[PDB]
Amino acid sequence: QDLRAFVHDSPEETETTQRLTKLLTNSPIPTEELVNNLPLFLRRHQMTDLLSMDALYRQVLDVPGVIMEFGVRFGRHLGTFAALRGVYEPYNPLRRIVGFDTFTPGGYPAYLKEVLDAHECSDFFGHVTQRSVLVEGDVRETVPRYLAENPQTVIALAYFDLDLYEPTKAVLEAIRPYLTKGSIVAFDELDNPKWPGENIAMRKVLGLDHAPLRLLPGRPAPAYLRWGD
Amino acid sequence: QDLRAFVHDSPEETETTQRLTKLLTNSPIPTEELVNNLPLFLRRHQMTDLLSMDALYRQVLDVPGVIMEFGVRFGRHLGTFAALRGVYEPYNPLRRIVGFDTFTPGGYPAYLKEVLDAHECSDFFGHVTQRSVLVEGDVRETVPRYLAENPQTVIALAYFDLDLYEPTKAVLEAIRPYLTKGSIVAFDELDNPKWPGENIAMRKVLGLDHAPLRLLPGRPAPAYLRWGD
Amino acid sequence: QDLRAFVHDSPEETETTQRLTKLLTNSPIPTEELVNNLPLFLRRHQMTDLLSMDALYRQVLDVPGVIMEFGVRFGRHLGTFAALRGVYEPYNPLRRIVGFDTFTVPGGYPAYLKEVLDAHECSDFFGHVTQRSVLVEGDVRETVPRYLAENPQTVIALAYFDLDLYEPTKAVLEAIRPYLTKGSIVAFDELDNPKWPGENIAMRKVLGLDHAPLRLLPGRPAPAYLRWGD
Amino acid sequence: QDLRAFVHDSPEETETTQRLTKLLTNSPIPTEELVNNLPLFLRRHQMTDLLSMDALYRQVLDVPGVIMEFGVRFGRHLGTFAALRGVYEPYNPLRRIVGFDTFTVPGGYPAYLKEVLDAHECSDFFGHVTQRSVLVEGDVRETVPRYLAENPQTVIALAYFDLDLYEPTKAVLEAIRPYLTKGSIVAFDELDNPKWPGENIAMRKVLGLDHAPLRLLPGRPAPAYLRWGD
Amino acid sequence: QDLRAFVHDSPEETETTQRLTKLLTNSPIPTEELVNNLPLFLRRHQMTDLLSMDALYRQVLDVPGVIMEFGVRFGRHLGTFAALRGVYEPYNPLRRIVGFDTFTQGRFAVPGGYPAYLKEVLDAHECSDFFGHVTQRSVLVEGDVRETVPRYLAENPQTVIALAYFDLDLYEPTKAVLEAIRPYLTKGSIVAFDELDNPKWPGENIAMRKVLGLDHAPLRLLPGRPAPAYLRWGD
Amino acid sequence: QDLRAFVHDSPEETETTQRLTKLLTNSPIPTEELVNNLPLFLRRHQMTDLLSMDALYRQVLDVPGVIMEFGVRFGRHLGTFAALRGVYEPYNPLRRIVGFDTFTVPGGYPAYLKEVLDAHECSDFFGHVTQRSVLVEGDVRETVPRYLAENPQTVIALAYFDLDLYEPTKAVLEAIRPYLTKGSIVAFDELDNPKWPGENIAMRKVLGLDHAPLRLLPGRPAPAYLRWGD
Amino acid sequence: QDLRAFVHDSPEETETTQRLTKLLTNSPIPTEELVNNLPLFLRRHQMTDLLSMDALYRQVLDVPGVIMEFGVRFGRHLGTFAALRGVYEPYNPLRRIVGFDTFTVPGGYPAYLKEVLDAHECSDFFGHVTQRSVLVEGDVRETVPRYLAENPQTVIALAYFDLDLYEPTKAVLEAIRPYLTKGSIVAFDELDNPKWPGENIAMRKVLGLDHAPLRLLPGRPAPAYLRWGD
C-alpha cells in the first residue's frame, strides 16, 4: 500500500502550520489581546472547516432540536458551534450541543468543559445549565443511554467523525427516530480511502441514495444530507 | 458626558474573554495542535467579525482589483483576508491585500509581515511576491503615494477604520477614481457616537444617500455600500 | 435533578416583568386609554409569542377550517387568534376558534374568558353569527372526540398543542387526523423541552418525528410546527 | 339548536340587498342600457362570488375538458362561466358547461335558463356549434352516470359541488373520478359549513380530507377547492 | 443495410479536419508554444464535446465521490476531466478519475501499450495540481469491465460515484457495469451515455431498458447536441 | 524592481507545459486523430482561458454585431471564437470576427492564421459567405478608425482588449464607442495588472472605472469585462 | 467589391427552394386543401422569419397601439401579423396593421395585397370594423407624416423597418418618435448588414446605437430590435 495515495499535508502546508505556531507562541501582541486576533493564525485549511460548520449550522436554524458530534478530537467543532449559537440563537436555550467521545490526554473532558463554560457565561441564557454536554465512553453504550435519558430529543444536526463501521452503524441506527425531515446528517470521511467503514455503514443502514449526499463546493468534506430529501 | 452611553463590554463579555485567554495560555492541547483548534478560543463577538469579513469578501469575488484596509490595529482583518483569499481565489495572484497604518509596539509591521508571509507560502501563487503589503505612515501621505506608484489599481474592497474626519475624508477622495460599480466601501464606526468623524467625512465627500448603506442584519458594524447602487 | 437545566427566567427578565406590571397598574394614562397602549407593557418575550402566532395564522389563510388549541392556560393565544381573525378574515364566519382545557385558574374562569372573546367578536363584521369562539371544558381524551362527533363539517386548519403529557397528546393527535388537509398546520408548544417529554414521546408513537418537516421560526425555541403532507 | 350559529345576513346586508333591488327595478337608466350597468347593483358579497369563479376558471385555462356544476340554484355560476368562456376562450368549442339539478325554481325554469345561456352563446366565436351549454334535469345519482355514459370523450377540468347532502355528493365524487386529470379542480360550496355537514362526510368517505390540498381563496369562506393530484 | 443512415462526417467536416491537421504539424508557431494555442486547431465538433464535459462536471461540483469513464478511446475525456478538476477543485484530492478500458511511432509499438502513454499524459496534468503530492488521483484499469469494475469497487469500499460516463457500445458490458455501480450512486449523481439512442450501437439502450428502464429517471440532452444523454439519479 | 511581483509561471506549471508539449509531438495517436484529442494536452491554465471566452460569447448571443480583438498574439482567441460561432450561431453570417495586430511572430504569420480560420469556416453552414474572418495588419490607431469608416454597418457585440499600452488602448476605446449598444461587452486582458498599467490609465482617462460595472468570472484574475450601459 | 461577402443563398438552399416550389405547384393534394398544408412547403429559413415575427408580436400584447411596417416587399410580414392578430387578439379592433411602400411588384399589386388581408379579416371577430389593415402607397418621407397627421390617436406598439436606405430610415425614425411609449418595439431588418449600411448610419444619426439595448433573437442575424425606454 502506497501511503502517498492517502490525503496528507504538502511540505508547504506543514511549513505554514509550523510558522504560524511559532508566531502565535512568540507573539508581540499583548497576551490579553491574542483571543481578539486569532484569525492571524487561522490558515486556509482551518478557515475552510469553520466556514463549513457555519454553513451546516445555517441550514438548521429553522429546525428544532439539538446538535450532536460523534467523535470530537480536541473539540474544534464544539467550540465553533458554541460561538455560532451565540451569533444566531441568543434566545434558544433548547439548542443543546452534545459531544460523544471515548477521549482516549487525561482529564481533557474537564478542560474542554471549562472552555465551553467560558463561552456560555456570556450567553443570553447562560443561567440555564446543561446546554453543552460531553458524554465520555464508547458510543455504542453512551448514545442509546443518552437518548433513553432524553426522550424529549429532536436531532437537528448530527456530525459523524467515528471512522469505523461498527460505531457508525450503531449510532446511525440509534439516532434515526429522533430526526425530522430537514435534519442534517454529516460525515467527516464518507468517501475517504483511509476510512472506508463510514461508507460501508452508510450503505448497510440507509443506502447512499437514501437521500442526496452533498458537498460544499470546493471542499472534499463534509459530505452531508438533508433527511427526507 | 456619561461614558456608559458608549459601547463597552459587559462584565460577562469580559469574563468570557479573560477565561478563554487563560485556557489558551494554559492548554493541555499539544502546542503544535493549537493552530488546529483556534475556534475553541474564538468567542461570539470575534466569530461575528470573521463572518462579516467573509460576507464582504464573498460580495467582491466577481469584482476585479485589490483589498485595502485603512487602520489595521494588530492585523485581525488582514489575517482573515489572507486565509479567505486561499479559500476562494487560489488562481488570482492580482488580489493584493494592502494595509495602511501609522503603527504607533515597535517593529510590529515586521511581525505582521511574517504572519502574512506564513499564510502565503502555501498559496498556489506563493511564488508571486507583493501580494500582501503593509504601508507604514500617515494615510494622507501614503495612500496617494501608493496609488501614484500603482496606476494599475482597481479597488474591489475598501475597509475604513480610521476614526477621524480628516484622514477618512482624504482617503475617500483619493480612492474614488479606482472604484468600479460593484466595489464595496465599508466603515467600522460610521454611526457610532464615540467616533463621529467618519460620518462627518462621509457626509462631506459623498452624502449618506450617495449609495445604499447596509448592515449585515444583527450586527451594528460594519456599515457598507456597493458603489454605483 | 438540576432544576437549572430547565428553562427559567433570568433575574433581569423577572425584573422587567415586575416593573412593567407596576407601571401598567399605576399608570397616569387615563383608564379608558390603557387598552390603546398595551404595547408599552408587552416585553420582548411576550412580543415574540405574538409574532409567532401571527406567523402561524398567516400560513393558513388559504386553508379551510377551524383553529383549535389544546391546553389554553389563561387564554393568551385565543385572544391573539380572535384579534388576528379580525385583521385577516373579516368575511370568514366559518373560522371558528375552539379552546379545550380542564380549566383547573379560578372557578368560573371559562365564563370570564368567553366574555373576553365575546368582546372582541361584537365588533367583527360577522359578529351576529354565534359560536365563532367555543371553550370546551373537560379532559381532551373525551371532549375532543365528542366535539368532532358533534361537528362532522370540521376541517382543522391549525391545531396548537400545549398539553404537556403523553396520554392527552397521543389521544388528540389520533382524533384530529381525519380532519386535516395537506397544508394544515400542527404546532407544538414544548416538543423538545426536557421538562415535558411526553409530547415528543406521543409524536414519535403516533406519527414519527420525520412524518413531516418540523420547523422553528428562526431564533425561537418554540413553537415547533409542521405542514401536513409535506 | 341555535340558528344564529349558522351563517346568515346581517341587517345591513339585508338593507343593501333590498335597496339595490329597488334601484335596479326603478332605474332612470334607459331599459336597453340596464345590462350595460349591472355592476351598479352587484354588491360586495356577490362580486366576491364572481371573482372566485374567475379565479377557479383561470386555474384551468391550460387543462382540457368541460366544466360541471352539481346543484345550480337559479344559474348564477352558469351565466358567470358562459361569460368568462367568452373572455378567455373564443376559440375553444370543446369547453362545454354542464349544469345538473333537479330544478325543484318555477316550472319551466330550465327552459328559461337555457334561453339565457343561448343568448350569451349567439355572439360566441363558435356560436354555430351546439350543445356547448347543457342543462341536465333530474337526480344526479341517475343523471351524472348517464351523462358520462353518453359522453365517453369526457375530460373534467372543473367540477363545482353545491349538492349539500351526503348521498348525492358521494355518488357524484365516485362517478367523476375516472374523468379527472392531474390539475383538474374539484370545488365545494359548503365543505366546512355547520349547516350542511354531508359534503364533508362524503369527502372523508370517498377520498379523505388530505387526499389533496384543500384551499380557500384568501378572505373567503367558500369555495374550498383542490387541484387533483397535488 | 444503407450505411449512410449512420452518422458519418460530411466532406466539409473531413476537409476541415485534414486542413487543421496540416496546419498543426507544419506551423510557424514555435513548437513549445503549441500547447498554448490548441484552440486554433479545435473545430466546432470537438469544442462541443469539451463544453459538454464541462457542463456535466459543473453539475456534480456539490456531489461527493469519483468520476468514472467506461470505454475511454484515446483518453480525450480523461484529459478534459483532469484539466477541469484543476479549474474547479484544487482542494479536492478525493475526486479520483478512473478510466476503464480493454485498450485493444507512428510504427514503433509503445512499450506498455497505449495505457503507458495515457498515464504519462495524466501525470503531466497532475504535477501542477495543488494536491499533486497525493497519488492515485487518476487511475487506468485495463481489462474487461465485467470483471474490472466489480473488482475495483470491492477494492474501494469508500467509493461514491458522482459521474459515470458510458461509452461501451455493447449490451453485456453496459448491463454488468450499470448493475455494479448502482449501490455507489447518490441522489444527484450523474449517469451519462455516449450512444444511448444511436442506431449503430443499440446494445446500450437495450441494457438501459433491461436494468432500469428509460423512465427510471429523466434522460436529458444538452440542447443542440445529440449526445451525451444523461440523467440525475433519483429525479 | 522585483520581477517576482509580476505574475509568472511556477516551476510546476513550466514542467506541465513542457511535458505536454513532448507528449503532443511524440504521440502514438495516429497523426490524423491528434486534432480529435487536443484536450489531452490542454492544461488547467489554458482550459480556463477557453471557458472564459465561452462565457463572454454566451453573453452576446442576443446582441447584434461583430467580435473584435485588439492584439491577437498567435490567434488563440480568434480560433476559439471561430469554433464557438459554429457551436452557437450556424445561421448568423453577420457575426464577423475581426482581429487587429501589428503582427511583429514570423513574417507572413497573418496568411497562416487566415488559413487556420478559413479551415474552420469551410465547414460552417454559411461557409460560402466570405469575409466572416478578417485580419487587419497595422497600428490600431490608424487601422481601427479606417476599418470603421469602411464598414458603417458596424455594430460591436464584443470588444476584447489585449493592447498593453496607453496610447493604442485610448485610441481604440474612443473609436469603438459609437458602435456599441447597451449590452455590448467590453473586455480587458490586463486591466489591473502591475506589468501593463497603461490599459487602466487609458480606461480611467476615456471612461472612468465606474462608467459601468467591471466584473471578473469568479476565480480568474482576467478577463475584466463590463456590459455597456449597466 | 467581392459580392460573396454579402449574404446569399447556398446551392443547397436554392435547391430546397426550387424543389418545394415544384411540389407546391404540382401537388396531388386537392386544390381546396393546399392552404391547410402550407407548412409542407415552408422551409427553415422562412419558418424562422415567421417565428421571429411571432416573438416580436408577443412582446407587445400588453402595449397599446398599432403595427407599422416600412417597406413591405410582397407582404409576407403583413399576412403574418394578420393571422397572429387573430390568434392573440380577437377582441382588439384598435390593433391596426399599416404597411407603407412605394410598391415599385406587378402593377395593381397593392389591390391584390388588400384582397389577401381582407380575406383574413372576413373571419375576424371584429371583421365588421373597417380600416384594420391599411396599405399606404408612396414615398415614406411624404406618406408617414401624412398618415400621422390624419391619425392623431396613433400609438405605435411595433415599428418594423425594411427601407434599406439612410434618408427614408432617418425621416421615419424622426416622425414616429412622438407616438412610441416605453415598451414599444422598434425593429430593423438590416441594421448591421454590409449590403445596406444606411439603416445603421440613420440609427446612429437620430438616436445612437446605445440609445436603447439592441437585441437579436438568438441564432438569427435579423431582426435587430429594441424596447423603447430600456
Numbering used by the authors:
A (entry chain C), B (entry chain C): 7 to 110, 133 to 257
C (entry chain B), D (entry chain D), F (entry chain B), G (entry chain D): 7 to 110, 132 to 257
E (entry chain E): 7 to 110, 127 to 257
Provide the authors' original text about this structure.
Superimposition of apo (red) and complexed (blue) CalS11 structures. residues 111–131 are missing in the electron density. of CalS11 shows enhanced mobility in the absence of substrate. binding site is more solvent accessible when no substrate is bound. completely exposed to solvent in many conformations. distributed between closed and open states.
Structural flexibility and dynamics are generally key for protein function. The sequence identity of NovP and CalS11 is 20%.
